Design an enzyme around this catalytic site. Structure first.
Site, PDB file in Angstrom:
ATOM      1  N   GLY A 147       8.032   4.085   2.816  1.00 19.60           N
ATOM      2  CA  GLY A 147       8.635   5.458   3.352  1.00 19.60           C
ATOM      3  C   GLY A 147       9.669   5.166   4.093  1.00 19.60           C
TER       4      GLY A 147
ATOM      5  N   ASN B 286       9.664   5.591   7.601  1.00 15.15           N
ATOM      6  CA  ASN B 286       9.208   4.939   8.827  1.00 15.15           C
ATOM      7  C   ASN B 286       8.608   3.481   8.491  1.00 15.15           C
ATOM      8  OD1 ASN B 286       9.019   7.434  10.629  1.00 15.15           O
ATOM      9  ND2 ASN B 286       7.844   7.944   8.794  1.00 15.15           N
ATOM     10  N   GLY B 287       8.769   2.866   7.458  1.00 13.11           N
ATOM     11  CA  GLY B 287       8.404   1.481   6.985  1.00 13.11           C
ATOM     12  C   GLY B 287       7.529   1.300   5.908  1.00 13.11           C
ATOM     13  N   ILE B 288       7.247   0.004   5.575  1.00 13.14           N
ATOM     14  CA  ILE B 288       6.421  -0.205   4.373  1.00 13.14           C
ATOM     15  C   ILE B 288       5.027  -0.725   4.930  1.00 13.14           C
ATOM     16  CG2 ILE B 288       6.607  -1.692   2.198  1.00 13.14           C
ATOM     17  CD1 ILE B 288       9.643  -2.409   3.292  1.00 13.14           C
TER      18      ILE B 288
ATOM     19  N   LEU C  10       0.809  -1.268  -0.089  1.00 12.84           N
ATOM     20  CA  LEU C  10       0.296  -0.036   0.206  1.00 12.84           C
ATOM     21  C   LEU C  10       0.951   1.264   0.056  1.00 12.84           C
ATOM     22  CD1 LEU C  10      -2.562  -0.933   2.375  1.00 12.84           C
ATOM     23  CD2 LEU C  10      -2.803  -0.860   0.040  1.00 12.84           C
TER      24      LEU C  10
ATOM     25  N   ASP D 211       4.250  15.642  10.537  1.00 16.80           N
ATOM     26  CA  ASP D 211       4.036  15.643   9.232  1.00 16.80           C
ATOM     27  C   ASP D 211       2.716  15.480   8.807  1.00 16.80           C
ATOM     28  OD1 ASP D 211       5.273  15.758   6.517  1.00 16.80           O
ATOM     29  OD2 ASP D 211       5.417  13.568   6.554  1.00 16.80           O
TER      30      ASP D 211
END
Lengths: 122, 273
Positions: free
Chosen positions: B37, B39-41, B34, B148
């Site tokens: 980034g 911070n993770g997948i 989905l 963010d």
């Protein structure tokens, strides 16, 4: 089934999260037994619950909701106002047009704008 | 995909891949990616009880942080924009040769905020901003600052219309420094303040989100950003209507999201009479 009764009972839950979920669920189910409970939830202390009840009433289309939804056009919360205006449109028909006609005449502010724009689009 | 670990993870994890939690033993079967980034997948994943959104990282600290943010939302006495939290665990990924941490949350789908308001009309913009402010008030009271906050991270589900956030990566504890930001929504970029995590940082972003929602595009600052923003707001019928809230958010007048919400409600009431 007994889900409908569970959700109607859940409209009396202490948690606004639970009441909100129940109002929305009852709108999806579309059962008529939910109409009077949802009309009461239009006066909930929580604006999300009120918004869900307004949407659900429009979705069911039972005209018992027409005057309660017109009162909801005066709601302090703008999500409720827009959703109620939308719900009246979803119910539609001559009784709503009749009420808008009156509303466009003896109304004010948003409620009047809704009436005036309803009449222009019908 | 930013460091070697996450990029290797991304190449490693395929549809059909199963991830089993070390401590709780739940199995997640990845269906499709989905999002991706620093911070993770994030994957759509299937469980025995249905589908979830699964966020995976090599960074256990950021996973734990995000889990606690979702838990903070879930403690609210009302609904909020955050997805429901389901599970968090560690796992070993043999192919990527790394330990990972993950969490499972509500899979929600709907149009991005900008798509929703383009389709349903600009009148929904202040309405959805008020919902956003209500949710930020919840987060702030729990000591979290969104940071963010931007339109690509906000969808509108329903009916009934509800703004939702699809990723809480980069949410930051109050008092710390915001390190995850997007220029257009960033107080520091515009020359209006610091990147200290405090409610007013988020409120600046809300103002810029409303501006983006109306203007339908981002733009660069010029030499005179304050006049630039003033001009845009005053020249638009909808933004002008909400200029008290928007100017106060830009200028740092507010200490809490509730104050901005009040000014937006008042501007709406006036028109609604």
């Amino acid at each position: 089934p007994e889900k409908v009764e569970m959700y109607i009972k859940n409209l009396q839950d202490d948690s606004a999260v639970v009441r909100d979920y129940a109002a929305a669920a009852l709108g999806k189910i579309g059962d008529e037994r939910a109409v009077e409970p949802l009309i009461k939830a239009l006066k909930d202390e929580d604006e999300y619950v009120r918004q869900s009840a307004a949407w659900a009433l429009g979705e069911i289309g039972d005209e018992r909701a027409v005057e309660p939804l017109i009162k909801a056009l005066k709601d302090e919360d703008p999500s409720v106002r827009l959703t109620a205006a939308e719900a009246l449109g979803q119910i539609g028909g001559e009784r709503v047009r009749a009420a808008m006609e009156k509303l466009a005449e003896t109304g004010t502010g948003f409620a009047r704008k809704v009436a005036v724009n309803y009449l222009e689009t019908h | 995909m930013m460091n070697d670990a996450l990029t290797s993870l991304a190449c490693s994890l395929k549809p059909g891949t199963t991830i089993k939690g070390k401590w709780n033993g739940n199995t997640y079967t990845l269906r499709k990616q989905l999002g991706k980034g620093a911070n993770g997948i994030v994957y759509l994943a299937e469980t025995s009880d249905g589908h979830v959104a699964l966020k995976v990282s090599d960074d256990s600290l950021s996973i734990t942080s995000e889990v606690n943010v979702l838990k903070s939302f879930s403690k609210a006495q009302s609904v909020t924009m955050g997805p429901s939290f389901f599970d968090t665990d560690d796992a070993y990924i043999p192919s990527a040769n790394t330990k990972v941490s993950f969490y499972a949350m509500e899979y929600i789908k709907g149009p991005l905020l900008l798509k929703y308001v383009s389709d349903k009309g600009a009148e929904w913009i202040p309405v959805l901003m008020i919902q956003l402010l209500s949710s930020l008030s919840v987060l702030h009271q729990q000591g979290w600052i969104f940071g963010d906050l931007k339109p690509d991270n906000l969808i509108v589900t329903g009916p009934p219309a509800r703004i939702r956030c699809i990723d809480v990566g980069g949410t930051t504890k109050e008092g710390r420094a915001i390190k995850e930001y997007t220029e257009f929504y960033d107080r520091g970029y515009w020359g209006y303040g610091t990147r200290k995590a405090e409610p007013s940082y988020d409120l600046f972003a809300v103002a810029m989100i409303m501006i983006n929602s109306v203007h339908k595009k981002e733009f660069k600052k010029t030499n005179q950003p304050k006049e630039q923003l003033r001009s845009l707001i005053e020249g638009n019928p909808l933004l002008q209507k909400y200029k008290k809230a928007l100017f106060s958010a830009l200028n740092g007048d507010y200490q809490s999201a509730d104050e901005m919400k009040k000014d937006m409600l008042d501007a709406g009431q006036k028109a609604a009479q």
